Amino acid sequence: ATWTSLGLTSLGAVSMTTTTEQSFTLPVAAQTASQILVYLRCHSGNASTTGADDIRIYTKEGAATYDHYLLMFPYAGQGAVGYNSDSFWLPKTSDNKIYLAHSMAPGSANSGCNFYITGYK
Ligand SMILES: [Cl-]
Ligand SMILES: [Cl-]
Ligand code: NA
């Protein structure tokens, strides 16, 4: 059940303004692993958008995708900070990439999304 921890190794800058599939190349240490452990967190305050953003996180091997999701629910105008996170395992596939896609772009205003690889085996 054990694995090699990478601490909070950022995977990259997450765009808040697109619903396109965002690609991140894995750090080289993880490129020989069989599985990767990732941590995705988000927060939204007085947002510029409203509605559910199911953020899709996945690796792929050919046509096969290995998908996880995280809810971000911006609500424009609110005077509070909402926040969510999840940490989950994905197969480390031959293209050495991991993907993130917003289903609704939450906007940059008063919001954030941070994406890390925290381990591998
Ligand atoms: Cl965040
Ligand atoms: Cl919340
Ligand atoms: Na929350």
Author numbering: 911 to 1031
The authors write:
The β-sandwich tip domain of Bd2133 adopts a twisted fold, trimerizing about strand G989–W999 (burying 5,640 Å2 per monomer). There are several atoms lying on the three-fold axis. Solving a 1 Å tip-only variant (A910 onwards) allowed us to confidently model these as a water, a sodium and a chloride ion. Unexpectedly, there are no homologues of this domain in the PDB (judged by DALI16), but FoldSeek19 found strong homology to Synechococcaceae and Competibacter proteins.
